[PDB]
Write a protein that binds this ligand. Structure first.
Ligand SMILES: O=C(CO)CO
Ligand SMILES: O=C(CO)CO
Lengths: 331, 331
C-alpha cells in the first residue's frame, strides 16, 4: 500500500483523510499525521484512526514509514512544508495553489526535480471523470477548430475567514480564479498565453474582490474568466469551436455533468464519504488514485498536471494580480 | 392609428410587417411599402395586405399619409434611408445597428434632433418583459452592490450570406455583439466605459469571426462579452452583485426567461405571428407598441434607448472592431 502522511489538520486535510480511508486498504494507508502541536495532531489521529501523531511537520518528514506527504496547510504555509518533505525524500501532493507566487512554485519544483522526487499540485478538478471526458472530446476534434472558452467562479465568501483574509493569501484569484486558469490552460493544451488583460476591484480586507481576465492563446484562440468572493456567478466552464460547445455544469470546479453539443452526460461521484467539509469532497478520490498510479509507474510528476504547467499557472496568476496592484510580501 | 411605412422588403421587414398586422387596427396601420423596384414592392404589398407600393424609398418618404418609417434595409443601407425619411419629416424606427460606424449614427442623430423628429434604434431586446423585469430588479437593489456581468452571443452562421458578407457589413460584432454591448450598457445605466480591451480573430470572408471584449465601467464594476459567427456559445446574459445574480436565459437576445437568485420567471411571447423568419420574431411587438407610446406622448426619442446611448453603443462597437484592425470604407 501507498503510505500517506498528513500535514496539517484543518478542514481540507480532514476531507482528504476521510477520502483516503474509503479506498482499498491494500492500495492506500494513512500512517501518520502532523500538526503544529501534538494535542491537535493526537485529536485528529484518534478521530481518523491514524496510528502515529506528531507535533511538528519536520517529525512527519523524517518518519521512514511515510512514502508520500499530503500538504494541506493554509496557502502561505505550503512552501516550507513541501520543502521539508522533499528534503527528507518524500513524494508530495501539495494543495492548491501550490505556492502564493511564481517563485515559490519554481523553488518547490526545482527541489523536487533535483532530488528525483514526485511532486504534484492537488488540482483535483482535472481528475474528475467529467474533466477527463472533456479532454477526450477535445482530442477527438468533436467541437471542430477551437475558438474560445470561458470559465467563472464566484460565490459570496465574505463570511468565510480563510477566504477573505490577507494574512492567509485569500481573495478571489487564489481561492477561485485558480480553477478558472487551470481550466482554460487545460482546454488549450497547457500553452503559454501570448497576452493577458485584467480588470478587477479590491475587497476591504486587503485582498481582491472580483476579477475578470482575457487571455490570448497561440493559434488565434482566447479564453476569459471571472472570479469573485462577493458575487455569485454561473460557476460553469465552456469551450467552443466551429462545430459546437462543451460545458462543465455548476459546480464547474467539481463537475459531474458534461454537456456536449446539447447532449448531457452525468458522472456520479463516489458514494462516500458523505458530509464532507467541502462540496463534492468525495471527488478527491480521483487525484489520490492518480498519485498512486504515477508512483507505481516510477513517475516524478503527473502527465495530467506537469510541474512546468504548475509553474505557468503560477506565472499567470501572479501577472493577473500584479496587473491590479495586489502585491504580497513574498511578492 | 399610427401610420407605418415599410422601407425594404427583406426578411426582417417581412417579420416586422407581420407583427404590426397583429396589433389593434385602431392603434397601427401599415399604409405603404417601398423596395428598390416596384415589382418587389407590389409583391410584398399584395402578400402583406398593404394598400400602397413604391419602387423607391424616396417616394415613401414623400407620402404624406406615412407618419413613421421602419427602415429594415441591410446594414450599410440604413443611413441614406434614415436621412431621406427625416428630411421628409417622418419619425423613424431604424433597424440595428443603426449605422455601420460612430459617424453614421452621429449624422442620423444630429438630423433627427435638428428637425424635432422621433428617431429610435430598433434594439428589440430592450422591450421584452424579461428585460424590463431585469431593469426593475436592478432599480430595486435586489442583487446588492453590482460587481460585473457577462453576455455571450455565438452561433455558426457561416451559411447565412447576410451574416458573413463583407459588403453587407456582417460579422460577429455587427450581427451579434451589438446585443451583448447593449445589454452590458443597460445594466450599467448607459454609462460610458473607462477602458476597453479586445481579443478576436478574423473570418476568411473579410469580417470578424469571434471577439471577446472586457469593459471597465465607472464605480469599479466591469462587463465582458464574447460573440462569434462560427462558435456556438451559451447565449445567456447575466449581472451579479454582492447579494446574487440575475440571468436572461438562452435566447438572451430574445429572452422570455429571467432567473434571479435561483428563482425562475417566464414571460410568454405574443401568440402570433408564428413561423417568423427569425427566432421569437413575435416579440417585435413590444418595440412597435413602444414607438406608438413615445409618439403619442410627443417624445423625440425613447427613454429606454436614448439617441445619446445609441451614439455611445456605436462608439463602443467601432472602438472594438478597430482594436482588431477590422476597418470599413465608411471607416
Ligand atoms: O474550493 C472551494 C472552497 O471555496 C469551493 O468553494
Ligand atoms: O438577430 C439574429 C440574427 O442572427 C439572431 O440570430
Amino acid at each position: 500500500a501507498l503510505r500517506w502522511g498528513i500535514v496539517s489538520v484543518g478542514l481540507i486535510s480532514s476531507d482528504f483523510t476521510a477520502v483516503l480511508q474509503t479506498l482499498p486498504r491494500s492500495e492506500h494507508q494513512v500512517v501518520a499525521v502532523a500538526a503544529r502541536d501534538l494535542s491537535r495532531a493526537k485529536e485528529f489521529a484518534q478521530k481518523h484512526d491514524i496510528p502515529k501523531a506528531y507535533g511538528s511537520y519536520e517529525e512527519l518528514a523524517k518518519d521512514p514509514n511515510v512514502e508520500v506527504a499530503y500538504v494541506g496547510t493554509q496557502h502561505p504555509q505550503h512552501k516550507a512544508a513541501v520543502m521539508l518533505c522533499l528534503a527528507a525524500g518524500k513524494a508530495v501532493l501539495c494543495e492548491k495553489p501550490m505556492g502564493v507566487n511564481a517563485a515559490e512554485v519554481r523553488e518547490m519544483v526545482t527541489e523536487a526535480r533535483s532530488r528525483g522526487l514526485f511532486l504534484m499540485e492537488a488540482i483535483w478538478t482535472r481528475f474528475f471523470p467529467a474533466s477527463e471526458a472533456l479532454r477526450s472530446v477535445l482530442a477527438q476534434g468533436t467541437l471542430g477548430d477551437l475558438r474560445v472558452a470561458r470559465a467563472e467562479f464566484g460565490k459570496n465568501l465574505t463570511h468565510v475567514p480563510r477566504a477573505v483574509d490577507w494574512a492567509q493569501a485569500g481573495g478571489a484569484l487564489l481561492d477561485l480564479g485558480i480553477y478558472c486558469v487551470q481550466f482554460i490552460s487545460m482546454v488549450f493544451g497547457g500553452q503559454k498565453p501570448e497576452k493577458i488583460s485584467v480588470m478587477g476591484r479590491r475587497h476591504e480586507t486587503g485582498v481582491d474582490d472580483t476579477v475578470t481576465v482575457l487571455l490570448q492563446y497561440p493559434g488565434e484562440v482566447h479564453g476569459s474568466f471571472t472570479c469573485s468572493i462577493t458575487a455569485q456567478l454561473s460557476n460553469t466552464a465552456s469551450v467552443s469551436g466551429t462545430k459546437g460547445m462543451a460545458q462543465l455544469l455548476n459546480p464547474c470546479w467539481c463537475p459531474t455533468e458534461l454537456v456536449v453539443k446539447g447532449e448531457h452526460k452525468e458522472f456520479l461521484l463516489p458514494p462516500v464519504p458523505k458530509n464532507c467539509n467541502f462540496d463534492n469532497g468525495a471527488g478527491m478520490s480521483y487525484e489520490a488514485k492518480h498519485v498512486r498510479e504515477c508512483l507505481r509507474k516510477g513517475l516524478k510528476e503527473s502527465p495530467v498536471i506537469p510541474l512546468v504547467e504548475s509553474e505557468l499557472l503560477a506565472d499567470i496568476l501572479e501577472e493577473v494580480r500584479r496587473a491590479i496592484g495586489v502585491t504580497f510580501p513574498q511578492d
